[PDB]
Amino acid sequence: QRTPKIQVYSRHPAENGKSNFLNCYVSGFHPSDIEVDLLKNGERIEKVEHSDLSFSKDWSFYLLYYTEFTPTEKDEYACRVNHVTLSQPKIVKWDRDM
Amino acid sequence: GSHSMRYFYTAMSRPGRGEPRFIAVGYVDDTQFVRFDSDAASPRMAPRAPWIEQEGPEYWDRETQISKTNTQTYRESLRNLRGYYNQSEAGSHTLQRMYGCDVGPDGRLLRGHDQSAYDGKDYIALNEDLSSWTAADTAAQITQRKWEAAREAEQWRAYLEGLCVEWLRRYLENGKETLQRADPPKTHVTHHPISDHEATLRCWALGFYPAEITLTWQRDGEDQTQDTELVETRPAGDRTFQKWAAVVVPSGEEQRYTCHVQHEGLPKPLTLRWEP
Amino acid sequence: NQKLIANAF
């Protein structure tokens, strides 16, 4: 089993007040079942789409979960991931600079 | 330049939760263009790129029929593999396959591919000769003997040298305004103070296609491989990809560092430095 | 264009 790598980032450079897309890219994991939530101020965003399951040359899986936001100075966004390899869900916060 | 077609198959057993799920996705280079999912309400080969939509009903009927036949064959294969490894009927297992062809700028076959993995471990692969197999273990040797008896390699060679390359060339022409367009990275360097003593220089590459890229940091002209943090190339969601590379630098030494970017969309490789 | 896979593992 392989535990997922997680990156949380925006499609376009973040400008407060301006509509954008929030991405959570999970990769490098095996087996393929995985739970991913996008969070706004700790609460689950309901309309989140995701890519079709594919995998890399080393057979590990990857998925992109995405939704529209509009970033602001104060709102906090995150991705919460659970997988068989994780004792408990991993939360990665969205950092504008990452 | 060069181009590839790939199909990626995943089959997953789930005892007590129905029959194994089968998913298939097709790619040209870094662009997905079809998907099939046996769990869909009405499973059917579906388009995922605009240039494949012009294929007529005969195409989608054939591809759907292949996907449904594969769904059944992969369920049979998962049952066989459980037996080859003396495994319990209670566990969930994964079978993956990835196959296709690479062509050069002239459209000629560079090589073909057909590889399989069981529970994430390489299982059997068609050799580059397209005529023999490499089996990972004694279970895969059972599969090899079955495929040798049925002359499976000859069927794969015919497919990879024939239909695979012919259809890849067709897709490349129908999708030429995107599949044959390299989009260069938009690049910049950011500066993130860590302490009085150190800061991070981060070199960004944004909006590029295809995903292949080289980002490196040099200090006094020497590569900083061991000291560079390099994130995995990641999809933006708009066809394009993103990447960054970071080094921790002593305060005041920022101008000894240069970021170097190679990508086929660039007329010439880039050298960047922090520009305060 | 997919290949028809009819030989199980």
Coordinates of C-alpha atoms in Angstrom, one line a residue, chain B residues 87-221:
Chain B
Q87 CA -5.7 -15.7 -1.8
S88 CA -8.9 -15.5 0.3
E89 CA -12.2 -14.7 -1.4
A90 CA -12.6 -12.1 1.3
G91 CA -10.0 -9.6 0.2
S92 CA -10.1 -6.8 -2.4
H93 CA -7.5 -6.8 -5.2
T94 CA -6.5 -4.6 -8.1
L95 CA -5.5 -5.5 -11.7
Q96 CA -4.2 -2.7 -13.9
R97 CA -3.1 -2.6 -17.5
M98 CA -1.6 0.1 -19.6
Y99 CA -0.9 -0.2 -23.4
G100 CA -0.4 1.8 -26.5
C101 CA 2.1 3.2 -28.9
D102 CA 4.7 6.0 -29.3
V103 CA 5.2 7.7 -32.7
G104 CA 7.8 10.1 -33.9
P105 CA 7.4 13.5 -35.6
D106 CA 7.0 11.6 -38.9
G107 CA 4.2 9.4 -37.5
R108 CA 6.3 6.3 -37.6
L109 CA 6.1 3.8 -34.7
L110 CA 8.8 4.3 -32.1
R111 CA 7.7 1.4 -29.9
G112 CA 4.7 -0.3 -28.5
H113 CA 3.7 -1.0 -24.8
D114 CA 1.6 -3.5 -23.0
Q115 CA 2.2 -3.9 -19.2
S116 CA 0.1 -5.3 -16.3
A117 CA 0.3 -5.0 -12.5
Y118 CA -1.5 -7.0 -9.7
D119 CA -2.1 -5.2 -6.4
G120 CA 0.3 -2.5 -7.6
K121 CA 3.2 -4.9 -8.4
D122 CA 4.5 -5.5 -11.9
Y123 CA 3.0 -8.8 -13.1
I124 CA 3.6 -9.4 -16.8
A125 CA 4.8 -7.1 -19.7
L126 CA 5.2 -7.4 -23.4
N127 CA 8.8 -6.9 -24.3
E128 CA 9.8 -4.2 -26.7
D129 CA 10.2 -6.9 -29.5
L130 CA 6.3 -7.2 -29.3
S131 CA 6.9 -11.0 -29.5
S132 CA 7.8 -12.2 -26.0
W133 CA 6.8 -11.6 -22.4
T134 CA 8.6 -10.9 -19.1
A135 CA 6.8 -12.6 -16.2
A136 CA 7.5 -11.4 -12.6
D137 CA 6.8 -14.6 -10.7
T138 CA 5.5 -18.2 -11.0
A139 CA 1.9 -16.9 -11.1
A140 CA 2.7 -14.6 -14.0
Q141 CA 4.4 -17.6 -15.7
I142 CA 0.9 -19.3 -15.8
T143 CA -0.5 -16.3 -17.6
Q144 CA 2.5 -16.3 -20.0
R145 CA 2.0 -20.0 -20.9
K146 CA -1.7 -19.3 -21.5
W147 CA -0.8 -16.3 -23.7
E148 CA 2.0 -18.2 -25.5
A149 CA -0.4 -21.0 -26.4
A150 CA -2.9 -18.5 -27.8
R151 CA -0.3 -16.5 -29.6
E152 CA -1.4 -13.3 -27.8
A153 CA 1.9 -11.5 -28.6
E154 CA 1.2 -11.7 -32.4
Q155 CA -2.2 -10.1 -31.9
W156 CA -0.7 -7.3 -29.8
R157 CA 2.0 -6.7 -32.4
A158 CA -0.6 -6.4 -35.1
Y159 CA -2.6 -4.0 -33.0
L160 CA 0.3 -1.8 -31.9
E161 CA 1.9 -1.6 -35.3
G162 CA -1.4 -1.1 -37.1
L163 CA -4.6 0.3 -35.6
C164 CA -2.9 1.9 -32.7
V165 CA -0.6 4.1 -34.8
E166 CA -3.2 4.7 -37.5
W167 CA -5.8 6.0 -35.0
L168 CA -3.2 8.0 -33.1
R169 CA -2.3 9.7 -36.3
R170 CA -6.0 10.4 -36.9
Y171 CA -6.5 11.8 -33.5
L172 CA -3.4 14.0 -33.8
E173 CA -4.7 15.5 -37.0
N174 CA -8.3 16.0 -35.8
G175 CA -7.0 17.6 -32.6
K176 CA -4.0 19.3 -34.1
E177 CA -4.8 22.8 -32.7
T178 CA -4.4 21.5 -29.2
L179 CA -2.6 18.2 -29.2
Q180 CA 0.1 19.6 -31.5
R181 CA 0.4 23.0 -29.6
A182 CA 2.9 23.3 -26.9
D183 CA 2.1 26.0 -24.4
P184 CA 5.2 27.5 -22.7
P185 CA 5.4 28.0 -19.0
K186 CA 4.7 31.4 -17.5
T187 CA 7.6 31.8 -15.1
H188 CA 8.5 33.9 -12.1
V189 CA 10.6 33.8 -8.9
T190 CA 9.1 34.5 -5.4
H191 CA 11.0 35.3 -2.2
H192 CA 9.8 34.1 1.2
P193 CA 11.8 35.1 4.3
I194 CA 12.2 32.3 6.8
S195 CA 14.3 34.0 9.5
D196 CA 16.9 36.6 9.9
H197 CA 19.3 34.1 8.3
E198 CA 17.5 32.4 5.4
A199 CA 14.8 32.9 2.8
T200 CA 13.1 30.6 0.3
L201 CA 13.5 31.3 -3.4
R202 CA 10.7 29.6 -5.3
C203 CA 10.7 29.3 -9.1
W204 CA 7.3 28.9 -10.6
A205 CA 6.2 27.5 -14.0
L206 CA 2.5 27.9 -14.7
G207 CA 0.1 27.2 -17.6
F208 CA 2.3 24.9 -19.6
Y209 CA 1.4 21.9 -21.9
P210 CA 2.5 19.1 -22.2
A211 CA 3.5 18.2 -18.6
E212 CA 7.1 17.4 -19.4
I213 CA 9.3 20.2 -18.0
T214 CA 12.7 20.7 -16.3
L215 CA 13.0 23.2 -13.5
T216 CA 16.4 23.4 -11.7
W217 CA 18.1 25.8 -9.4
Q218 CA 21.8 26.6 -9.7
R219 CA 24.1 28.3 -7.2
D220 CA 27.2 29.8 -8.8
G221 CA 26.4 27.7 -11.8

